[PDB]
Write an enzyme that holds these catalytic residues in place. Sequence first.
Site, short mmCIF file in Angstrom:
data_model
loop_
_atom_site.label_atom_id
_atom_site.label_comp_id
_atom_site.label_asym_id
_atom_site.label_seq_id
_atom_site.Cartn_x
_atom_site.Cartn_y
_atom_site.Cartn_z
N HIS B 41 0.83 -1.24 0.00
CA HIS B 41 0.00 0.00 0.00
C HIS B 41 0.85 1.27 0.00
O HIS B 41 0.24 2.34 -0.07
CB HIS B 41 -1.11 -0.03 1.04
N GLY B 143 2.61 5.77 10.16
CA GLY B 143 4.04 5.83 9.83
C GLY B 143 4.75 4.54 10.21
O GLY B 143 5.91 4.34 9.77
N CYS B 145 3.82 1.34 9.43
CA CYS B 145 3.64 0.24 8.45
C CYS B 145 5.01 -0.21 7.92
O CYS B 145 5.83 0.65 7.69
CB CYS B 145 2.72 0.63 7.30
C1 LIG Z 1 0.26 2.24 7.72
O1 LIG Z 1 -0.23 2.43 6.41
C2 LIG Z 1 1.27 3.35 7.91
O2 LIG Z 1 1.84 3.48 8.98
N1 LIG Z 1 1.47 4.11 6.84
C3 LIG Z 1 2.39 5.22 6.79
C4 LIG Z 1 -0.96 2.35 8.67
C5 LIG Z 1 -0.69 1.94 10.12
C6 LIG Z 1 -1.90 2.20 11.03
C7 LIG Z 1 -2.37 3.64 11.17
C8 LIG Z 1 -2.85 3.76 12.61
N2 LIG Z 1 -2.08 2.72 13.28
C9 LIG Z 1 -1.66 1.75 12.46
O3 LIG Z 1 -1.19 0.68 12.78
N3 LIG Z 1 -2.01 1.48 8.13
C10 LIG Z 1 -3.16 1.92 7.59
O4 LIG Z 1 -3.53 3.08 7.59
C11 LIG Z 1 -4.04 0.84 6.99
C12 LIG Z 1 -3.98 0.89 5.48
C13 LIG Z 1 -5.35 1.29 4.97
C14 LIG Z 1 -6.27 1.42 6.15
N4 LIG Z 1 -5.44 1.08 7.32
C15 LIG Z 1 -5.83 0.94 8.59
O5 LIG Z 1 -5.05 0.52 9.44
C16 LIG Z 1 -7.26 1.32 8.92
N5 LIG Z 1 -7.95 0.14 9.40
C17 LIG Z 1 -9.01 -0.36 8.77
O6 LIG Z 1 -9.52 0.10 7.75
C18 LIG Z 1 -9.58 -1.65 9.37
F1 LIG Z 1 -10.62 -1.42 10.13
F2 LIG Z 1 -9.93 -2.53 8.45
F3 LIG Z 1 -8.69 -2.26 10.11
C19 LIG Z 1 -7.39 2.53 9.84
C20 LIG Z 1 -8.89 2.84 10.03
C21 LIG Z 1 -6.71 3.72 9.16
C22 LIG Z 1 -6.77 2.31 11.22
C23 LIG Z 1 -4.82 -0.08 4.67
C24 LIG Z 1 -5.48 -1.31 5.26
C25 LIG Z 1 -4.28 -0.30 3.26
#
Ligand SMILES: *[C@](O)(C(=O)NC)[C@H](C[C@@H]1CCNC1=O)NC(=O)[C@@H]1[C@@H]2[C@H](CN1C(=O)[C@@H](NC(=O)C(F)(F)F)C(C)(C)C)C2(C)C
Lengths: 305, 305
Positions: B41, B143, B145
Amino acid sequence: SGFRKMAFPSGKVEGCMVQVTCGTTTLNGLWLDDVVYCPRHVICTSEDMLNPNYEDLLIRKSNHNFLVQAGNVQLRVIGHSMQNCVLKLKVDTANPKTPKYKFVRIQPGQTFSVLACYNGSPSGVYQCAMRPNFTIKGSFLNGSCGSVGFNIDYDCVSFCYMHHMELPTGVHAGTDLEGNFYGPFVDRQTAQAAGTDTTITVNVLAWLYAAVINGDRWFLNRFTTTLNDFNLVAMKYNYEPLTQDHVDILGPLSAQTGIAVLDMCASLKELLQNGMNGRTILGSALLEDEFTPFDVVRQCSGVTF
Amino acid sequence: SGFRKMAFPSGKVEGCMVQVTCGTTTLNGLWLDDVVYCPRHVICTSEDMLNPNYEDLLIRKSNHNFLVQAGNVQLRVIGHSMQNCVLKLKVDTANPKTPKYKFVRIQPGQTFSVLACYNGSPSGVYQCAMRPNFTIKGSFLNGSCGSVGFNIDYDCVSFCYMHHMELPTGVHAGTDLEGNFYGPFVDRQTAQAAGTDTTITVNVLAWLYAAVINGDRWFLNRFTTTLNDFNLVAMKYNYEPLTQDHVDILGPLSAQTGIAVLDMCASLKELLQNGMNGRTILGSALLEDEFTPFDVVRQCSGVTF
Ligand SMILES: *[C@](O)(C(=O)NC)[C@H](C[C@@H]1CCNC1=O)NC(=O)[C@@H]1[C@@H]2[C@H](CN1C(=O)[C@@H](NC(=O)C(F)(F)F)C(C)(C)C)C2(C)C
Ligand SMILES: *[C@](O)(C(=O)NC)[C@H](C[C@@H]1CCNC1=O)NC(=O)[C@@H]1[C@@H]2[C@H](CN1C(=O)[C@@H](NC(=O)C(F)(F)F)C(C)(C)C)C2(C)C
Ligand SMILES: [Cl-]
């Protein structure tokens, strides 16, 4: 989200650990530049340790009697001196992995990471607090002496603790890197007990802020309190007095959540007086006091090194 | 003595962390030999992530669109491919700090260390368990991921987890290093919930053995039980069935303490039926299930890496 007891990354300290052997005693040392620091009781046998005369034992040792090993490589010792409870072995090779570092004496209530080591090799890393009674609640076996405690600030490793001994209750005591003990302890095998411990109030408040940031808000009440009235109640439950310096250090968490420190103090007073009623805060059934305000901000802001 | 949640030393993994940027998305990657592994992603904008077609987004990217940084140094990307939920960027430089390593898919109930990273830089290390519902109880911010989970066996780093997402309740989900998710999760921003979690029985027993080794023996009763009768009682309290394989894995702790696994099962049954009555075990008011039998033996024997 989520809140975990988190240690500093240990890699900068892993590159400094060596083994020191004097006769049949082996323990860990810390190699920075061309000096190896280790507990002075490396120079005792078992029998010496009931009442050692360290100055006397060290006069009978010469450089070649200290076997220092960095992995498979022997480091040649070219000088030795004692500073308080620490031996300093000068070696002919500077450690090329020496990080930017400082020696710091921490205050009770402050936290650090311990890199538990055996035979100069890392076993694990965990986070500790210097307790008000100058003990840490560690995990240390025979062979762990000379394991170190540290904080990292960007690139700079602040060494604050060298492990020496275990006290009754399975708590631990040791020195700063200038070899001065934390607390009233001595490096002799004799009856020694920690004083009564006390709960680090400012750290419990920091953790309740961490709980609010994570959405655990059930314990917030509608009241405020005065610093004076809070401290009279805390005293009863063996909580440290909360000082204006502590209130000022909690300022960033207070500003971030919009909850005044004295309103959180009113919530803590109700938890102490009434208990948790079988509920948890951040998954814990007990109030946690080993997170500093700075530990909460780092973890909830993603500070890196 | 003492018993602490302990992480693996992180230094071997710290030397593998890099930053990957594609457009305005930045996250962490793992650099082993001449390949960088990161969550696929990285190639989405915010809006792509509600229902991304990753194959479609990746066809429009070329090597030069991936900015990989190892500290200050840019690594030139010379190939790219997708494997399940992971992107593999081939780079023109082998990481000289690559440890001996393996990719392993762990089983629910197994533990590992997470090195939480932001912008390719380590923030902290903590220990997790793969829950029976295929979540971990982590601490991860935006941040994080591409942060990784690992075990060390002497010199060999076994990578088992790459971080991708946060679920309701502030629990976490991710993939093995072949990009296959643990559990039924997908890398799309849509309503997803973990199943009901269950307590890892074999780990609770391992921790009661740790308590006996440390001299916390109050909960030992004078009874035995059958595996069948234990499992009927455990079922009620949402404990995983205990299998003969689990009993066999507990053999070393059983042999060390002289307490048969089914006698410890009788003690656990009484704690589940009667509660702890305001007492603690190893300082905890709740039964702990994130220590494996191997974690207990390592910590109580001083295994090093
Ligand atoms: C990751 O993409 C990152 O750090 N990017 C710079 C991030 C980590 C995440 C954010 C908050 N704490 C964490 O562990 N992951 C995401 O944003 C993923 C990406 C998009 C949506 N993501 C989520 O974790 C969602 N969760 C959901 O949609 C759910 F319900 F299905 F779990 C939230 C709502 C942003 C937390 C991906 C799944 C591609
Ligand atoms: C350390 O010497 C080592 O690891 N050497 C290889 C060792 C660490 C210690 C053993 C058990 N867990 C630990 O943390 N330290 C000691 O053995 C010290 C040395 C001798 C006596 N030591 C003790 O820790 C005593 N404690 C006491 O006498 C007491 F009560 F005062 F604390 C025990 C009884 C061996 C635990 C020194 C103080 C020089
Ligand atoms: Cl608890």
